[PDB]
Amino acid sequence: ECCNPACGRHYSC
Numbered sequence: 001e002c003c004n005p006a007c008g009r010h011y012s013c
Contacts, residue, residue: 003013 001013002010005011007013
């Protein structure tokens with residue numbers, strides 16, 4: 001998972 005806003009296009013939460 002990538003829940004931080006900085007994940008950007010990688011956001012997956």
